[PDB]
Amino acid sequence: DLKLPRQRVDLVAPPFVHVHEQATKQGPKIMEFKLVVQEKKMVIDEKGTTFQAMTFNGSMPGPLMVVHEGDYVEVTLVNPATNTMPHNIDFHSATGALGGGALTLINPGEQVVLRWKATRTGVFVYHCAPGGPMIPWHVVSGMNGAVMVLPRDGLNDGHGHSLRYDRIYYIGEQDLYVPRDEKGNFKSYDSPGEAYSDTEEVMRKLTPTHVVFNGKAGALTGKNALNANVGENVLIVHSQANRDSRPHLIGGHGDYVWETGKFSNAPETGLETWFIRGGSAGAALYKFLQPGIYAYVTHNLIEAANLGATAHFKVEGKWNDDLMTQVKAPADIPTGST
Amino acid sequence: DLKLPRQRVDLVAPPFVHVHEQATKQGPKIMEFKLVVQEKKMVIDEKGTTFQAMTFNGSMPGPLMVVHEGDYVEVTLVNPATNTMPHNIDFHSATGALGGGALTLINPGEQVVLRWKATRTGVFVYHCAPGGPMIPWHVVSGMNGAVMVLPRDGLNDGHGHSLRYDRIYYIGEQDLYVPRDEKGNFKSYDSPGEAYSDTEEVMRKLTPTHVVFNGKAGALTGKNALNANVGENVLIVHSQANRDSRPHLIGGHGDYVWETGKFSNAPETGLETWFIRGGSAGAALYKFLQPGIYAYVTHNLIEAANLGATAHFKVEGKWNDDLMTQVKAPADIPTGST
Amino acid sequence: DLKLPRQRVDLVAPPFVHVHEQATKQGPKIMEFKLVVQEKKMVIDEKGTTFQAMTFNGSMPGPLMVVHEGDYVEVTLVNPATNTMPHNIDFHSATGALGGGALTLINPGEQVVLRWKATRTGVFVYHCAPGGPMIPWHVVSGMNGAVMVLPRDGLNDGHGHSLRYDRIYYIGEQDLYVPRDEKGNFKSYDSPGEAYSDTEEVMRKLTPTHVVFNGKAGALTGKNALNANVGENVLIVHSQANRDSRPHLIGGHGDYVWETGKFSNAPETGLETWFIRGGSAGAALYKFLQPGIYAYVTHNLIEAANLGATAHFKVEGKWNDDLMTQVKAPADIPTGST
Ligand SMILES: OC[C@H]1O[C@@](CO)(O[C@H]2O[C@H](CO)[C@@H](O)[C@H](O)[C@H]2O)[C@@H](O)[C@@H]1O
Ligand SMILES: OC[C@H]1O[C@@](CO)(O[C@H]2O[C@H](CO)[C@@H](O)[C@H](O)[C@H]2O)[C@@H](O)[C@@H]1O
Ligand SMILES: OC[C@H]1O[C@@](CO)(O[C@H]2O[C@H](CO)[C@@H](O)[C@H](O)[C@H]2O)[C@@H](O)[C@@H]1O
Ligand SMILES: OC[C@H]1O[C@@](CO)(O[C@H]2O[C@H](CO)[C@@H](O)[C@H](O)[C@H]2O)[C@@H](O)[C@@H]1O
Ligand SMILES: OC[C@H]1O[C@@](CO)(O[C@H]2O[C@H](CO)[C@@H](O)[C@H](O)[C@H]2O)[C@@H](O)[C@@H]1O
Ligand SMILES: OC[C@H]1O[C@@](CO)(O[C@H]2O[C@H](CO)[C@@H](O)[C@H](O)[C@H]2O)[C@@H](O)[C@@H]1O
Ligand SMILES: OC[C@H]1O[C@@](CO)(O[C@H]2O[C@H](CO)[C@@H](O)[C@H](O)[C@H]2O)[C@@H](O)[C@@H]1O
Ligand SMILES: OC[C@H]1O[C@@](CO)(O[C@H]2O[C@H](CO)[C@@H](O)[C@H](O)[C@H]2O)[C@@H](O)[C@@H]1O
Ligand SMILES: OC[C@H]1O[C@@](CO)(O[C@H]2O[C@H](CO)[C@@H](O)[C@H](O)[C@H]2O)[C@@H](O)[C@@H]1O
Ligand SMILES: OC[C@H]1O[C@@](CO)(O[C@H]2O[C@H](CO)[C@@H](O)[C@H](O)[C@H]2O)[C@@H](O)[C@@H]1O
Ligand SMILES: OC[C@H]1O[C@@](CO)(O[C@H]2O[C@H](CO)[C@@H](O)[C@H](O)[C@H]2O)[C@@H](O)[C@@H]1O
Ligand SMILES: OC[C@H]1O[C@@](CO)(O[C@H]2O[C@H](CO)[C@@H](O)[C@H](O)[C@H]2O)[C@@H](O)[C@@H]1O
Ligand SMILES: O=N[O-]
Ligand SMILES: O=N[O-]
Ligand SMILES: O=N[O-]
Ligand SMILES: O=N[O-]
Ligand SMILES: O=N[O-]
Ligand SMILES: O=N[O-]
Ligand SMILES: [Cu+2]
Ligand SMILES: [Cu+2]
Ligand SMILES: [Cu+2]
Ligand SMILES: [Cu+2]
Ligand SMILES: [Cu+2]
Numbered sequence A, B, C: 001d002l003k004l005p006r007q008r009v010d011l012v013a014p015p016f017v018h019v020h021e022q023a024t025k026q027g028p029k030i031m032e033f034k035l036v037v038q039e040k041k042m043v044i045d046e047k048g049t050t051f052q053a054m055t056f057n058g059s060m061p062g063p064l065m066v067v068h069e070g071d072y073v074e075v076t077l078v079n080p081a082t083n084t085m086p087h088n089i090d091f092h093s094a095t096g097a098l099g100g101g102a103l104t105l106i107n108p109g110e111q112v113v114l115r116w117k118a119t120r121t122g123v124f125v126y127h128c129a130p131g132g133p134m135i136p137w138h139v140v141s142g143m144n145g146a147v148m149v150l151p152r153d154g155l156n157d158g159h160g161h162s163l164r165y166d167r168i169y170y171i172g173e174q175d176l177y178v179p180r181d182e183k184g185n186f187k188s189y190d191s192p193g194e195a196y197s198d199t200e201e202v203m204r205k206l207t208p209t210h211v212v213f214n215g216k217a218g219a220l221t222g223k224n225a226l227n228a229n230v231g232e233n234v235l236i237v238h239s240q241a242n243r244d245s246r247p248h249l250i251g252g253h254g255d256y257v258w259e260t261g262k263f264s265n266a267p268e269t270g271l272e273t274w275f276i277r278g279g280s281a282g283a284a285l286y287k288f289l290q291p292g293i294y295a296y297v298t299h300n301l302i303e304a305a306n307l308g309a310t311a312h313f314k315v316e317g318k319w320n321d322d323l324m325t326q327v328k329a330p331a332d333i334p335t336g337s338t
């Protein structure tokens, strides 16, 4: 019945994004994606703490899917027989059937195929939602990602000017609720099911033990810092499926920010810190003006520095002393100071 | 002195709203409302937990009052002699005297009459505020509601087009702080006064034990699901007098959202999740496009599924397979899969 | 090299602000400021609780710095030898080198001079950020303030009309994490270093023990209430370097609010409650219409009334009975009531 060209997309692991066009003159297509659920123990912090994760495609977050307004998105969701739990998928981008969750519940050993029309532009969360208390548990166990639905003319500033990014990164932020023993040490389990009761008790007190980008403390620091160059316009897509976040690029700004994440609304300009509502994605464009290290954080600095929520950008280029300069290096306070 | 026609309004219990006009050619009126304080033990969760509530008109939230810009609102607040505490009322819609709280403190056995001019359009919180620590306690005990002040021309999209709703619902969200004994069981008390000291200790740690719509977990699910039909534009007014919330309609969107709740500002379009600041009301319009069950949640999914904060809509109509379809029902994974 | 006139500014303690022009016909200048770090024990609540604070210029918050777009800001940061820790400064208004933190780390007995160009309009946080876990600790110990970068034409309403304030106040909100002993009493220490380990444990649970304006519970109440007059337009700058806040003027509104704090964006109009993202500053203009006491709060009322986060305005003038009136004072409920 639906007689449109089909295009298969190969997803890539965050924080990278699969190849796509911004502006397009192609007409609507059926864009075909595959997501495979993987339950596995994962390391989440720099001390080696593990937890029983549940993921789309083996990553936290799940991969970013990119389509254009008016495309149809045909998703095959696979739940391999090595998994222990039923899973499904809910797209905040989609209309009807609890975002697709009501049509995608699959037991281990099954797959399902859902199609949804991309009628709404923006970045949106997708997440597992099997029913009842399983909804938060699967989400906070890692089963969430995002999809971006671009206008066919690409982004704009809300005032009739096109905006084009040179690079895009997807930062998925995850709140984790890891059980502790009586002495405060994190507990380990042999399966997600075995971890559930203790995990739910932590969840109920609404205070995460970890808040991480790309699935673990330090994931996007060191050798996995995000690269850019002076003069490049970088789009940073940020999602949080369960809990608020307040992104901030230390030493930079958000030149154009869609904090609610929807491109039918004009972006705000020149922000210091923006706000991602739990259960949403947002996006910020920034043109780098200075080289060096930048930290990208949630600006609850306790979370950023002590719970895991810091990424780095490493930016190549020449320093601009007009924008900022050290006039006088650290020196002893003059004795003739009052 | 104030020589305007008077109109008595009969309030109704949430989530319904008293009859009113959207656009009106009537001139300003004195709109007369009565609120009666009721202290009573109420069931707040599906396991039968009770707590010592304090309410306007016997409901959590208090009823939605609806007037138009330039009306005067004359409120009789009654504190029956069966109550134990003084009470008052503060309208975030009103100008002066702490929103009216400074002019409305009444002991049991007393009533008071306040008039305020509706100079500011939007949805606004009202709440009790007797003074000092009694302010949070009365609010988190249930003494809060909302008022909507419509433009006389009804709603608009901020771009010169009228917006009209077919149905309106008022969802009041309440954070509750129920004491526990040493084993974790909820405690019961014979009066609000007896509950206070233990309740304040819970309040101080800023983590609710329950987060509910319309006064209890499950209030707006099952047989009390909210009704709508495909094609209807539904206005959902959401308030939270004390704590942030992040509303989301699962399987839908916010077509037009005033998250800060004030109709002098253009709405945002096509949101997935919006944000109600503690101490405010907001509103979202959505035109249903698909039949079925929708869950309306705060998108902290722990709160939604585990603390009580889920409502349902039941939407009648015909399914649109263009917007979404199950291409292939759950099936075994092909053996020839890699 | 940089051949512009230099102007020395003398800062004043919050909530007041140093003298400045709104609109200016002056060209760009090098605006010279000095900040001196002071570590000291400070009283933070009405029961006399102390804590080991770290401050810019002896105050929490640090002073508000005011410049215009295109000015250069040359800041001398001094760390006296009586201090125990290294300190630095990061300006969210500045571009590069982690906002200046990477160029300003000074040991006790040293000073440093940083210059940054004010290319972005708005109110912005500045804070200490020495590295790693020291970042949140220094911030939540008091080392944060704000800077305002005005357009050279002053404020506007986003619709081509100038806005001018008669008075400005800077409200810095601080979340504090004071250790308790086994019985719940707050602990005291002889130095910041000695307090660190216990303080970090509190910080990790993300629940403050105190939330205060201008450095202590009750700071801006009583004889230190903020003054205004009916008819005056008052700008209230609000910052929070670490944690969200939801400001509300009880009995008033935000006539024009920049909740994200950046003057390149049009303000929202007629708000009840607004939202300051942790790691940002915002600003609200209000024209007082009624005399009397107003409370300015974060509208988590537990925080406001029980954790310290209430300020007062005392407004002189004549009451307007058109806006609000007590029609009938408290009286016994008529016996002939049903
Ligand atoms: O012996 C505990 C010690 O070993 C580490 C190794 O990096 O991790 C082990 O214990 C953790 C806490 O139970 C587990 O999460 C992990 O699975 C296990 O290898 C340290 O983290 C831990 O302190
Ligand atoms: O708005 C994007 C997209 O949403 C649809 C529904 O699929 O329209 C919705 O939003 C419109 C514009 O705000 C409303 O007028 C409409 O009533 C509502 O369903 C699409 O038609 C539109 O392209
Ligand atoms: O956090 C409480 C308490 O637990 C201990 C071990 O007894 O440390 C645990 O908690 C730390 C904070 O989350 C982690 O850094 C560490 O991995 C974990 O074992 C104590 O060191 C701490 O006081
Ligand atoms: O890119 C940052 C990196 O560049 C160096 C020189 O290679 O210094 C530049 O950046 C500094 C600010 O971070 C400037 O103060 C300096 O003048 C400029 O040359 C490195 O020192 C720095 O890490
Ligand atoms: O015996 C405790 C058991 O009875 C229930 C009945 O539904 O409720 C009682 O105890 C609760 C906890 O103290 C009270 O809140 C309630 O008022 C009382 O009827 C169960 O909830 C409870 O577990
Ligand atoms: O704005 C709605 C309503 O507020 C009033 C005061 O009651 O005006 C306020 O807002 C105006 C427009 O933003 C400001 O110009 C004014 O100074 C401020 O008092 C009413 O006059 C107006 O209808
Ligand atoms: O929550 C702690 C602990 O308390 C128990 C009873 O000892 O359950 C209580 O708490 C549950 C979570 O809020 C409620 O579902 C129940 O109504 C309440 O009695 C334990 O079951 C739980 O481990
Ligand atoms: O309204 C939802 C309700 O309708 C039924 C048929 O009565 O199925 C419709 O809705 C489904 C999605 O929820 C579609 O997949 C189906 O094709 C459509 O007919 C019920 O199965 C469903 O609960
Ligand atoms: O004896 C404790 C008692 O004295 C007070 C005096 O106002 O403060 C003392 O103890 C506090 C808690 O340790 C300290 O923070 C403070 O430095 C010290 O003077 C009371 O607050 C306290 O309850
Ligand atoms: O926007 C204020 C200020 O920022 C600068 C950079 O210092 O420009 C940024 O914002 C512009 C307008 O949004 C973008 O076009 C530009 O690419 C970005 O660097 C200044 O040029 C401008 O005055
Ligand atoms: O808060 C727990 C518990 O501690 C006590 C003293 O044992 O009070 C402390 O905590 C109160 C709340 O923060 C403070 O008002 C007071 O300054 C502090 O000593 C108990 O009174 C309270 O139950
Ligand atoms: O400014 C508030 C202050 O003024 C007084 C009279 O001096 O009363 C005025 O304000 C009241 C509302 O707060 C009005 O009801 C009254 O009519 C008006 O004269 C004081 O009573 C009040 O504290
Ligand atoms: O599908 N839930 O475990
Ligand atoms: O300025 N960053 O924390
Ligand atoms: O009026 N307060 O309990
Ligand atoms: O998509 N709702 O959780
Ligand atoms: O400089 N840090 O303690
Ligand atoms: O209306 N103020 O809490
Ligand atoms: Cu799942
Ligand atoms: Cu969702
Ligand atoms: Cu009350
Ligand atoms: Cu209020
Ligand atoms: Cu410092």
Ligand SMILES: [Cu+2]
Binding pocket: A248, A250, A299, C090, C092, C127, C279
């Ligand atoms: Cu910062």
